[PDB]
Amino acid sequence: ISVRGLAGVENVTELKKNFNRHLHFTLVKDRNVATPRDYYFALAHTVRDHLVGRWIRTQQHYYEKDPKRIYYLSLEFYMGRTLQNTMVNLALENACDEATYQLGLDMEELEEIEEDAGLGNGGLGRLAACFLDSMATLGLAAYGYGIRYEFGIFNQKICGGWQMEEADDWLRYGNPWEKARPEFTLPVHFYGRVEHTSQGAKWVDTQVVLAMPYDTPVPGYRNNVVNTMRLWSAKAPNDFNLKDFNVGGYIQAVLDRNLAENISRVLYPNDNFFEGKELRLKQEYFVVAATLQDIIRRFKSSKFGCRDPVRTNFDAFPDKVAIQLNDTHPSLAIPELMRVLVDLERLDWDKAWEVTVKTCAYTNHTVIPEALERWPVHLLETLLPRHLQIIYEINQRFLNRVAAAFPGDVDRLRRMSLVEEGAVKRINMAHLCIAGSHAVNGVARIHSEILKKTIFKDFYELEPHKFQNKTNGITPRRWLVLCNPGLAEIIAERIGEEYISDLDQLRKLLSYVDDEAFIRDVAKVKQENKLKFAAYLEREYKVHINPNSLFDVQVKRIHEYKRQLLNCLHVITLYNRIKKEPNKFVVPRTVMIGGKAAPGYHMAKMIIKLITAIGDVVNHDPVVGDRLRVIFLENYRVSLAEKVIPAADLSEQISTAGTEASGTGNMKFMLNGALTIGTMDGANVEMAEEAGEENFFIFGMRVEDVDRLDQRGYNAQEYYDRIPELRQIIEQLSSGFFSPKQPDLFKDIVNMLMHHDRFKVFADYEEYVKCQERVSALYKNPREWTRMVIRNIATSGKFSSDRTIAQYAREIWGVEPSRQRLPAPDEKIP
Amino acid sequence: ISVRGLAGVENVTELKKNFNRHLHFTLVKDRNVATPRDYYFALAHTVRDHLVGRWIRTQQHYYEKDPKRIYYLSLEFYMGRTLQNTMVNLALENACDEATYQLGLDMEELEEIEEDAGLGNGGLGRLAACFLDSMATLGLAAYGYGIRYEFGIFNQKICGGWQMEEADDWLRYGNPWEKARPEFTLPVHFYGRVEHTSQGAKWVDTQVVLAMPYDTPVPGYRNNVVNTMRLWSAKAPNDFNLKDFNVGGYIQAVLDRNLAENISRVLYPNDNFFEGKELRLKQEYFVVAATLQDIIRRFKSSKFGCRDPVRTNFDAFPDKVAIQLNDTHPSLAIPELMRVLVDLERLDWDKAWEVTVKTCAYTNHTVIPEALERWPVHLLETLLPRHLQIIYEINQRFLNRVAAAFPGDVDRLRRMSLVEEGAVKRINMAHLCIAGSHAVNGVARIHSEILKKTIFKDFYELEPHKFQNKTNGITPRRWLVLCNPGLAEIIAERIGEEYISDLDQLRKLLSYVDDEAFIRDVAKVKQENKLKFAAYLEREYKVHINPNSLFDVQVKRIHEYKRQLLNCLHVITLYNRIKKEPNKFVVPRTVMIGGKAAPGYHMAKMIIKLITAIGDVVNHDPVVGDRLRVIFLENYRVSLAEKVIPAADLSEQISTAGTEASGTGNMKFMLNGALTIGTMDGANVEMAEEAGEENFFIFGMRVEDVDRLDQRGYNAQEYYDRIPELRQIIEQLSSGFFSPKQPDLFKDIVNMLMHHDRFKVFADYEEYVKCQERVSALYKNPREWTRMVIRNIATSGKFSSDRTIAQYAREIWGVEPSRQRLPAPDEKIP
Numbered sequence A, B: 001i002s003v004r005g006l007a008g009v010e011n012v013t014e015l016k017k018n019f020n021r022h023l024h025f026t027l028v029k030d031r032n033v034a035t036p037r038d039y040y041f042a043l044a045h046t047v048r049d050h051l052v053g054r055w056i057r058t059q060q061h062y063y064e065k066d067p068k069r070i071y072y073l074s075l076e077f078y079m080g081r082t083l084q085n086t087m088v089n090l091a092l093e094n095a096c097d098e099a100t101y102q103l104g105l106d107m108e109e110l111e112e113i114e115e116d117a118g119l120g121n122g123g124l125g126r127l128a129a130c131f132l133d134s135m136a137t138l139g140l141a142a143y144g145y146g147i148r149y150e151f152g153i154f155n156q157k158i159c160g161g162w163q164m165e166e167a168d169d170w171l172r173y174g175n176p177w178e179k180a181r182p183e184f185t186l187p188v189h190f191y192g193r194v195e196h197t198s199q200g201a202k203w204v205d206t207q208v209v210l211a212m213p214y215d216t217p218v219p220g221y222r223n224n225v226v227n228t229m230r231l232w233s234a235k236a237p238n239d240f241n242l243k244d245f246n247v248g249g250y251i252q253a254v255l256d257r258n259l260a261e262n263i264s265r266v267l268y269p270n271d272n273f274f275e276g277k278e279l280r281l282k283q284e285y286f287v288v289a290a291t292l293q294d295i296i297r298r299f300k301s302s303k304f305g306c307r308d309p310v311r312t313n314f315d316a317f318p319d320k321v322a323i324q325l326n327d328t329h330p331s332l333a334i335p336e337l338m339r340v341l342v343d344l345e346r347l348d349w350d351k352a353w354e355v356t357v358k359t360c361a362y363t364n365h366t367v368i369p370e371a372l373e374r375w376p377v378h379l380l381e382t383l384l385p386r387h388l389q390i391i392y393e394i395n396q397r398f399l400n401r402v403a404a405a406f407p408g409d410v411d412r413l414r415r416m417s418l419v420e421e422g423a424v425k426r427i428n429m430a431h432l433c434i435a436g437s438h439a440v441n442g443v444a445r446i447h448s449e450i451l452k453k454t455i456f457k458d459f460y461e462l463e464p465h466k467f468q469n470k471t472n473g474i475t476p477r478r479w480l481v482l483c484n485p486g487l488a489e490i491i492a493e494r495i496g497e498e499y500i501s502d503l504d505q506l507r508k509l510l511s512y513v514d515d516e517a518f519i520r521d522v523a524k525v526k527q528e529n530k531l532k533f534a535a536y537l538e539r540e541y542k543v544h545i546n547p548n549s550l551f552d553v554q555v556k557r558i559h560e561y562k563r564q565l566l567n568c569l570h571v572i573t574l575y576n577r578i579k580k581e582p583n584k585f586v587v588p589r590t591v592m593i594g595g596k597a598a599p600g601y602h603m604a605k606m607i608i609k610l611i612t613a614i615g616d617v618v619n620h621d622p623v624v625g626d627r628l629r630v631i632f633l634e635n636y637r638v639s640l641a642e643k644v645i646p647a648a649d650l651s652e653q654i655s656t657a658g659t660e661a662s663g664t665g666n667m668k669f670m671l672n673g674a675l676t677i678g679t680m681d682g683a684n685v686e687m688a689e690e691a692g693e694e695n696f697f698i699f700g701m702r703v704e705d706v707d708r709l710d711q712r713g714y715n716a717q718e719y720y721d722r723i724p725e726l727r728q729i730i731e732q733l734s735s736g737f738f739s740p741k742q743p744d745l746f747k748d749i750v751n752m753l754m755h756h757d758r759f760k761v762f763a764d765y766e767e768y769v770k771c772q773e774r775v776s777a778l779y780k781n782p783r784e785w786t787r788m789v790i791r792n793i794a795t796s797g798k799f800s801s802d803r804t805i806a807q808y809a810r811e812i813w814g815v816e817p818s819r820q821r822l823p824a825p826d827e828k829i830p
């Protein structure tokens, strides 16, 4: 059937009965009233059964051996469905497929019932998930720590061409994977005031919110290691949240509990944008405060909570602990670690600071100013008083270091301050992270360099040793084996299976680049994938597409810097050229654009309306026929990504040079047989470098060109004046060609494009369409197109998260990865 | 060990492994980190496993045979713990005891970990629970329908002698018994307006709240029947509760979902008191609207949803359905049934009305005015517009019936109206129920008569056939076998086990009233029970009592009509007499008073402070020694009731004649070997009548005396003037003898007692203490005390809920009870 494992005789029989046990005892249903949803749960529970054994021994193991623990703090974890992924890492896919088949059910039909765990906005959240999968696969004692939002990223609905947001109640039917651990609930404080008494400061009169943990298992790839992702849930104490007496109402008091519990109610739907709301800050301290207590407790036990030097010496803390800050969201971990160490454990400042800097590491994910976290001091002042004091004290000592290093450089001082003066004083979270961490890293080579050259230049000059780079990656398991079994099979037919956990081995495929059979096969799976997607489209969304055309797709969150607008310009151009010479042949294309706009991002929502507007015109023009279709992929999410990517021919990664930190979608397309048309931005540079620029469609300004233009000054009118085709499009938008009933509907877009385009869309127009012509040319030559594809696929190995994690492990955490199978799952009950 | 069943070889082995399976796979724990709480859950799950098989066949059975269904609508279901009760009804107690013993665990210690299901205030809620247990035992196709509050009755805390309320988060650790059934979620409407168009009225522009059901199994006693208790939970739709666009905030919109979900958040903590809050009304329509849809759906399938006459003829509705209204709380079921029938199903008014009256029955639980539900019309007007219209129309036709029966009786007309004029117009829910039901019943013989003679006299004269009586009962299982295995064993040793489901058989114990061995045994178990309680007291609450003294206890909700105050007067009197003649012998007593005061009931809370105040004095007076202790039982609840009742010698049921509808606590004491000192009120009358007044301690005014006094006019001063002892007590309270630091602390009580005592406490003082002297006399004669006890126990059979339910079944529902064992639980998987 494929290498989804063995369909053993004994195990298929075993599976079936357990499937039945659960249907009866767990779901309390009988075959005569069970629905697909019930069948999905019976299975889920049956599968979950298989990793509890391993989950328990893995955790017990780490307790015995006591290795250095890695803690990945992130406000986001974009998990997606977990049934299939679990079967894959446990080599259970074929057995389950067989068993369910014998039970008379279609496993695939059941997998579609699982709701996505959308606790993330996009790239940052998905990285965290791939990282988790990689850390388990590499046998690291790592824990993902976050918030268990009851409402993840909103489900996108297109009404009249406009995006409509609706609550994502992903827990509505229950989450068979998580394990509530009410017994480990911890208290978290808010507000209050600071008392300075005799021997130390005291955080007093605080409001208490409880943090209840929920554990979700993270299985490594076929190595019997199952790590833990601990998500926190806000709960109100039953005392003060009722006991603070003297009139108000008993009923009202109970109803008001949903005020402390609002903290973990919903994820903020912003991608690369900073919103300074109190709720957000509260979420940020909540996950930090709870997690740290859990970390220190585990440490207090270790082998110190037995003997060792005997005396809670936190000198060995950094030797046992390592916490990674995914962006600045969990930045309060730094001052909070100091608070505990200094205030509660009573360590002297300097010893506390040494420990903190040695255990903390920060990862930066963007350079755009609007995405930088700058919290108003009055907020910190009211909500976390003692933390503010600590930050000022950190700032004080840091600046003293600077002054000592650069005597007289008074401007440098203000520039590096963690405190920003002006309208309202703010705290530059990024500056905080750099100062209190031993390592800071970019997510792509160019991005990392930009940090040292620009944004954090002064910090680099002060401590060059802190700055590193760790190019992002993705997991081959979910992003290849899971979503593209067909491609994985033919690859395995030639080079084996060892590449699943050693993606570099894909290079061996280079020697098949001229293999007639292979070329045919690679080409075949992609054709099958396109057919399956084309079907899914009519199945769930309804209104036909042509599987023979080139599948042109751009899927990622809607942003001005992502330039979906530039994509739009090309599409309209194609249309206009066809309308000019109808009977001229052109390579058929189905351009698919998908992604979510943050609810408050007016421009982004305007762009979605534009895309749909273009399709209304293009898709109903008889002269165009089936040569050009414009489709807006609805509710783009992980599960949807696993369907389109494998079916894509052309991958669009066209951000303005210098704006996309790295990107990971791009990597997903490269590994699944799609060619890339893009700019020398983020990881695109390393991809083309890895596959050779001849096998990549690069175009547009490089970072330097962008800057040159900015010195000069960017004037869009010039491009409007010199390019007729471009002019024609702008005037079409301005006159209502795409919005008859509302002729001025797109004035904001046009206005912006002409007068305040921060991302100079026009500057890359000419080179972009020219380049698009080159890909159409190559598509006309199937054999050569496929051969270039083989060149990309065979060379994408470097982009596996296993590599990224291996690097974090060695160069930052100080731990050695291991592909050693944990001692089987075997029963055991001590 | 006892007759808790057989500890079979095969089953104990089977239990153990399943206990282990759950500890591992379900709890995901290993013996080395498992806590008593974990062990409790492993067991619970193991036990729950045993009744799913039966639950499924029972439900499937009713589907095949299709008998008349009984629907018990109640806003309250005071369940308590369910582990033990389940083991008992499944004959699993000894086996579990053995198995857990072999696993090295104390089953009793684990049972104490289960949280109480306190979804009730007191008697009304507990009746519903006993009824459920009886209906299952009698093999009726009955369903308990209610609301799944996430917060039940508040946990009571005594701070400085004052009651402190704190949220009862009973679901904090999960509820292993319930089964979420998200697939059966139903919509419920609120607000909107009524449109009258061509062919009928339309309820329009309504706000939708979803109702998610949760099923809890209700096992009959050893007959393999497991019925269902369906509790509804409020959920917000993800559309409009987000989709009603045009600014407000996406985050805020998601946070505001906890506004529709507040409906099932907390139980109103009022016992015998009406609070007209909107939230309450919303809870009332919520449970009604959802339940009815579920009832009609089931009906539409029946055997009509196949063939029969073919044409949804609701003429057979009352032959298949019967809904019981537990008090007026679910009263909206009447107008809602009409709404559906007339508005949606399109039946003519008269046919709809005939059907409704034929399927609805109402049970009245009180005569005090402040407990009567009178909803302001403006409320109904805004929240349920169409229902108000229906009510007016019902009222219109009803009054026309009255006018026709009593021509010219204009006063009668206003008196019977469902609509009450005055300050604000109200709707008399009780009047509604009577009019739209074919049967109305009291909960005790005297109570029922009072209804016909007083409160509902006019209604009785109009339709005498509607009024009946159904004396309350209690379940012998939880209230004897479960809480008092010792007593149950010795009884069984003589007369067998058949009395557990046939309590009348207890009469056979009469012939052992002179049996020397029995007398010794009855006396022995009560001594053991008192010792166990005396221990529990020091264990969990701490501060000694004497097990040789008479256990004088009054436990029930705190009320002015319950007269805990009268109890107080006696206690103080005893104290004063002792302080007068210290070296005179008096029978030692431990008087225990316990119960919860509704948070807004100032007087009731004042009384709790008085009780504790008395104990502060009495318990620390050296001259008193161990002859008199005053103890306030904290957080009285079902689980606590199962501990005190079996340990009680004297049961206090001293309400003012005519105020306690029936009472059930009294019955609980009678069956567990306690003698009763009480007034001829509620079921007390039938108890003494059943055991013979010679074996009862009756005292005080009868109903007639009360009325005589009211004609005359009640003047407390007279009693104050003629009884020195009474005077002495009042002046002690007035001067701060019981409240040194705050001498005027009890002015409200004294003032009330002297000028506005609605329950004439003073009028029964003299006869009460005189009577108390008689019980002390008899206690001095162990052999005779025990013999009188045997007379009560042997004669309590009539008070089993099996009898009550059998009567409802035959005289109201039109169904025949059956003690037929359902065809085993045996595997089966069709």
Ligand SMILES: CC(=O)N[C@]1(C(N)=O)O[C@H](CO)[C@@H](O)[C@H](O)[C@H]1O
Binding pocket: A122, A123, A124, A125, A127, A271, A272, A327, A365, A366, A371, A443, A472, A660, A661, A662, A663, A664, A682
């Ligand atoms: C701030 C933020 O979330 N940044 C982003 C992204 N929005 O996904 O993180 C991911 C993961 O590192 C990178 O691939 C993107 O280029 C970067 O912009």
Ligand SMILES: CC(=O)N[C@]1(C(N)=O)O[C@H](CO)[C@@H](O)[C@H](O)[C@H]1O
Binding pocket: B122, B123, B124, B125, B127, B271, B272, B327, B365, B366, B371, B443, B472, B660, B661, B662, B663, B664, B682
């Ligand atoms: C209105 C109400 O709840 N009434 C009560 C009670 N409060 O428990 O119901 C129970 C059960 O019928 C009766 O035993 C009490 O005498 C009656 O007062």
Ligand SMILES: *Cc1c(COP(=O)(O)O)cnc(C)c1O
Binding pocket: A121, A122, A123, A126, A555, A556, A557, A636, A637, A638, A641, A662, A663, A664, A665, A666, A668
């Ligand atoms: C990988 C992924 C992303 C990130 O995409 P980029 O192209 O790097 O912006 C966002 N959303 C989902 C659903 C993803 O799988």
Ligand SMILES: *Cc1c(COP(=O)(O)O)cnc(C)c1O
Binding pocket: B121, B122, B123, B126, B555, B556, B557, B636, B637, B638, B641, B662, B663, B664, B665, B666, B668
């Ligand atoms: C039986 C019971 C009641 C009712 O008591 P009465 O004495 O009839 O007022 C109230 N609460 C609990 C906990 C009960 O078990």
